[PDB]
Paper text:
Highly ordered structures of BaKynB and a complex with 2-aminoacetophenone at resolutions of 1.9 and 2.3 Å resulted and confirmed the binuclear Zn2+ environment. We also investigated 2-aminoacetophenone given chemical similarities to part of L-kynurenine. This ligand provides the aromatic component of substrate and product and primarily lacks only the 2-amino-4-oxobutanoic acid moiety. Formate did not elicit any spectroscopic change but L-kynurenine and 2-aminoacetophenone gave comparable Kd values of approximately 60 and 50 μM, respectively. However, the characterization of a BaKynB–2-aminoacetophenone complex structure at 2.25 Å resolution provides a suitable template to inform on aspects of molecular recognition in the active site. Key to ligand, and by implication substrate, binding is the interaction with Trp20. The 2-amino group forms a hydrogen bond to the Zn2+ bridging water or hydroxide. In this respect, the complex derived may closely mimic the configuration at the completion of the catalytic reaction and immediately prior to the replacement of product by the incoming substrate for another round of catalysis. An intramolecular hydrogen bond between the amine and carbonyl groups of 2-aminoacetophenone appeared to be significant. Therefore, such an intramolecular hydrogen bond probably defines or constrains the substrate conformation, and orients the scissile bond such that the formyl moiety would be directed over between His60 and Ser149.
The proteins involved in tryptophan catabolism are in general highly conserved across species, but with the notable exception of the second enzyme in the pathway: [name]. This enzyme catalyses the conversion of N-formyl-L-kynurenine (NFK) into formate and L-kynurenine. Our attention was drawn to the prokaryotic [name] [name] (EC 3.5.1.9). The [name] subunit, approximate mass 23 kDa, comprises just over 200 residues with about 50% in 12 β-strands and 15% in four α-helices.
Residue numbers in the entry:
A (entry chain B): 4 to 209
B (entry chain A): 3 to 209
The structure:
């Protein structure tokens, strides 16, 4: 059974957060110039395309990306539809079967345009954390750039999720995949000092 | 149990790069004190830093870019073998291993293993290795050094021949803390539309 790509393409047309570094890939040394190889240079914000946050992003004493447990980003995941909801909390999630789930991906179907930064997204309410924590959920993923509203500076959801040991994955592309169980892979790069990492997220149907 | 094991080089500002190539840089542009909410970071690097894959574009102007690459190649059963104390590695040195049904192969040269220094000399792969591995069904080869060709070679025989036989390339895996044998491997490139390679997080789990 094939792996399916649920990552946003990364190129110089991708959207970023306002005030983040624009994405740049450029060929530093071409093959004409080097005599052998095309060699690339990559400049970006960590939070561009499909990626994971580390606690250090929103907490000065938080863990950096390399201090994170890799076991969390690989394994069984459940995918659910939570479209047409302004916000998502305990109430909206109690209707789903979630027993023994370790990793949960939410399809909001809210945006899905990797080249535009949205004006508004559905966010997670802070009661979601104790609820998911209690069920054993270590990772939550959403198909939008954030778990908190776009203009919120408190980042309640970020803080609460990581206080309950739930890790965060943003900007997965879920419109071409059905609800259900899969294996997930979405590993961060081994960055010693970083606040997050882009990843290649992929899934395979159980 | 059966935990995944990291076989990637740590990426930080002391990592080595190819001579004259973009040095690696992770830096906080705007801190949480300054912004009132978030540490805002910037990542600058060469593609060919730390553990990473090559795409055919890197050495062929008409080669595929990273996103054109088949992801199924970079996930699945792999075999690890020890080829230390060899100046070069070809058919001859691999014929002593039983390699039937293998799709992905990792070679421990134990030649260098210092992520913070760029080596003066490495063991390279000879070009006869490609038909040999190709015939057996091998789609990916990995080495614990920065290149499959010698550090100063401009022809890049090994690169060209590997990809001409549909064998993909993974460089700078860290193998000294892992035993030979069978594993599941994961080493996926980032979804880079226009790039000549991608860094990866390579990990393995014992079968
Ligand atoms: C930097 C890089 O990728 C490179 C440059 C010269 C020769 C071989 C290489 N892999
Ligand atoms: Mg052309
Ligand atoms: Zn983020
Ligand atoms: Zn976030
Ligand atoms: Zn390379
Ligand atoms: Zn190479």
């Amino acid at each position: 059974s094939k792996w399916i790509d649920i990552s946003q393409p990364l190129n110089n047309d991708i959207a970023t957060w306002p005030g983040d570094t624009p994405f740049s890939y450029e060929v530093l040394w071409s093959k004409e110039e080097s005599g052998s190889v095309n060699v690339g240079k990559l400049t970006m914000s960590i939070h561009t395309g499909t990626h994971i946050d580390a606690p250090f992003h929103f907490d000065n004493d938080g863990k950096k990306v390399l201090d994170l447990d890799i076991q969390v980003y690989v394994g069984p995941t459940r995918i659910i539809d939570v479209s047409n909801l302004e916000s998502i909390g305990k109430k909206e999630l109690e209707k789903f079967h979630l027993e023994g789930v370790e990793r949960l991906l939410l399809r909001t179907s809210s945006h899905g345009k990797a080249n535009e930064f949205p004006d508004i997204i559905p966010h997670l309410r802070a009661d979601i954390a104790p609820f998911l924590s209690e069920k054993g959920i270590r990772l939550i993923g959403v198909d939008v750039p954030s778990v908190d509203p776009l203009d919120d500076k408190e980042l309640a959801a970020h803080h609460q999720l990581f206080k309950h040991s739930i890790h965060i994955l943003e900007n997965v592309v879920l419109d071409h995949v059905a609800d259900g169980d899969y294996e997930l892979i979405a590993l961060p790069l081994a960055l010693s000092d970083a606040d997050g990492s882009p990843v290649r997220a992929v899934i395979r149907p159980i």
